[PDB]
Design a protein around this ligand. Structure first.
Ligand SMILES: [Zn+2]
Ligand SMILES: [Zn+2]
Lengths: 76, 287, 31, 68, 81
């Protein structure tokens, strides 16, 4: 790719503003790329994860507390 | 004598029944019962609110694993003992409890050197890290390899199993994608200089070879993913021609001197080059 | 706590909880 | 100097607390609270109904992912 | 309701449009063809809006393979389609 002008073997024997504008242009692309990457990586977790035992307990506790408060209000 | 007796050799303390029903009511959601037992324990003295179940769980660590934000405030308006209760809410990724604990500002599972900003980086949350960096925090700095100060040689002979863990913890903290994308000035050139000196460390430390080797791989996919999120050609031309401190590929040459084989073997980078190797032959769609 | 999956046994307990809640609430309210 | 400081290099805007409780009530299902906040914002002017959470989600994109 | 889908040009087409746009933005011109070809190859649309659903899968699964030789960048995608 570089300009060397390499002939074959036989015939081989005979200041501020630019830097500022570049650094200003380089940042918005980085910002947009970071935004898109973060959004995609957050979305990707929502779909490919399974369930475990921890959630069953929270569901049970929710139902239990609902029942207890409703019974407290209605009974008395 | 053909029988084998059984007994406990290492005994501990046991609790009483009065205390028992308290912790039993905390685990079910009863809000009108616990609020009474908290009140009779201020005129009479029969129960201590700092008990511990057989497994070391107190009355405040049971309401965190079951996400209940209405009993936590009730136990907090009364004076309870809050110990290392902020490290149990960052390992289980919940957001309300974190703030809530921040606002009201001998046994554990964590080593005595873990700090919250370092533990929140082992996990990979983006919303929790942003809440701790708005307040002022700091992370230590590791010395260079083959450093020979008096500190590096004195501590390395009084305790040699504790000195070899903090460096691994720090290097696991420093290498997370979210922190690099949140607090760096050039997120592409900082993954080149850091994924190269995590591999030299894999030769002098024979004990943790696999760990250091695997940490060196999370820094090679980040750059590729950050690159393949482009949507036009001007963005590619601006990126690949950035020189810090003319118009040649001044950033595709630094990726070859670091042996990055996934950053230079991508469809877009291999299609930008094919339009310069075939200059003067406008069409190669021939027989 | 972290590396175990679910099965059919839990669905039945959830259903029974909802059923008993409904029955007791209906008994109190109706009469 | 053996410490490393940390800060944000690319800043954005932040919302206010008054707005915060609106989006917090949308995410839980409260129907009698949001219907009031929609009404006081027509006589007085203190909240804009086109805000955006830190992740770019508005008040209409939270009620779509939770099917309500 | 009335809708419409564009039509892609034949291979080796040489109009002024195919040669002008392919040199002002070359990364955006190579994505719309893939999007269109992913849209056209769905089972439901073929079974819903075709007159002969068997003879249209023969002539379309044969010219998605020739495209896999001139476009070296998206070989796997075209092959799987
Ligand atoms: Zn050292
Ligand atoms: Zn064309």
């Amino acid at each position: 790719f570089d300009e060397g002008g390499t002939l074959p073997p036989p015939f081989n024997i005979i200041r501020h503003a630019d830097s500022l504008i570049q650094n200003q242009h380089y940042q918005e692309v980085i910002r947009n790329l970071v935004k898109r990457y973060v959004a995609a990586m957050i979305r990707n977790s929502k779909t490919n994860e399974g369930l475990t035992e921890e959630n069953f307990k929270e569901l049970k506790q929710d139902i239990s507390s609902f029942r207890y408060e409703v019974l407290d209000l209605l009974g008395n | 004598r053909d029988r084998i007796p059984l007994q406990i050799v290492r005994a501990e303390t046991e609790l009483s029944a009065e205390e028992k029903a308290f912790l039993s009511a905390v685990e079910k959601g009863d809000y009108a019962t616990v609020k009474q037992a908290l009140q009779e324990a201020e005129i009479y003295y029969n129960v201590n609110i700092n008990c511990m179940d057989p497994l070391g769980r107190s009355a405040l660590l049971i309401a965190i694993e079951n996400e209940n934000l209405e009993i936590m405030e009730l136990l907090l308006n009364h004076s309870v003992y809050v110990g290392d209760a902020l490290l149990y809410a960052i390992r289980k990724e919940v957001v309300g409890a974190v703030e809530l604990l921040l606002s009201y500002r001998q046994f554990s599972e964590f080593t005595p050197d873990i700090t919250p900003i370092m533990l929140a980086a082992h996990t990979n949350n983006y919303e929790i890290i942003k809440l701790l960096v708005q307040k002022r925090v700091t992370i230590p700095r590791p010395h260079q390899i083959r450093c020979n100060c008096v500190e590096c040689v004195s501590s390395s002979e009084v305790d040699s199993l504790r000195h070899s863990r903090s460096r691994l913890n720090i290097y696991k903290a420093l290498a997370s994608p979210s922190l690099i994308a949140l607090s760096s000035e050039d997120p592409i050139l900082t993954a080149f200089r850091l994924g190269w000196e995590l591999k030299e460390l894999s030769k002098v430390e024979n004990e943790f070879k696999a760990e250091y080797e695997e940490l060196s791989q999370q820094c090679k996919l980040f750059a590729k993913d950050l690159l393949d999120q482009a949507r036009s050609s001007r963005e590619l031309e601006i990126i690949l021609n950035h020189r810090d401190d003319y118009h040649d590929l001044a950033k595709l040459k630094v990726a070859i001197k670091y042996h990055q084989k996934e950053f230079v073997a991508q469809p877009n980078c291999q299609q930008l080059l094919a339009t310069l190797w075939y200059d003067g032959f406008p069409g190669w769609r021939r027989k």
